[PDB]
Amino acid sequence: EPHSLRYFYTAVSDPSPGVPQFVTVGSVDGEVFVRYDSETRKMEPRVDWIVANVDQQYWDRETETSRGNEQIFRVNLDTARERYNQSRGSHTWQCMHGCDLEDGSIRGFQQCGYDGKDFIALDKDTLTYTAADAAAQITKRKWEQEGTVAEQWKNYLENTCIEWLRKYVSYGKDVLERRERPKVRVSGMELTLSCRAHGFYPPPISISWLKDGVVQEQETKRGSTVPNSDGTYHAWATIDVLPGNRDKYQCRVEHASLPQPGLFSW
């Protein structure tokens, strides 16, 4: 039921296989819907619902914005290298921005990082920038002195971003608001019991192991929930038990596609 729009920007000084000099990825509720890179040089759809709902002008404008960003990010890499008095080498510049829509209230953020460490972030409430170190303090002064940067970002995050999110959620409703039931299998080795849930949506899920109906929280090991190729998800929970206690254990799976939590035995 909550919703988010995210843009992920990555520039590198030394590109490599699968890592172009500059990439922008857009995502809605954690699903990638648009992408641009310095090689294709155009914003391109990554899901059906976006192409079916926007005009050519949308693509032209996103492409134009991204072509300009590419140049900005190249300069950021040069400037950062000079600020930290670094020699030529492999470096990364990243920015992330987005907005959240949840239960009447909205959230927004804009943050940049250099070589995978914080550099600068917008404080939307005070319209100032939070600098991570002395190098970033120079950027803080520049952006704040400019006098419209923070304001433009607040406007974007609180209005434009949210307006487009609402549109995107509407365009992708059949995808984004659907429910798909996990297919669950229990396994065992030696005894390690494994409860695997396949193909569920949305991503929130709770997989627990029960001994005679009793939740074994301290004993339950869990993976991170991970995507399948079709936009469904995968999660697992395991437990170590004595091979004689096998039949005391059940896996409980709570999920929005399940009116009641599912219970599974090996």
Binding site: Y7, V149, T160, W164
Partner: peptide, 9 residues
Amino acid sequence: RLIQNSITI
């Protein structure tokens, strides 16, 4: 959609 008119550090 992307914010326009971005700025260098």
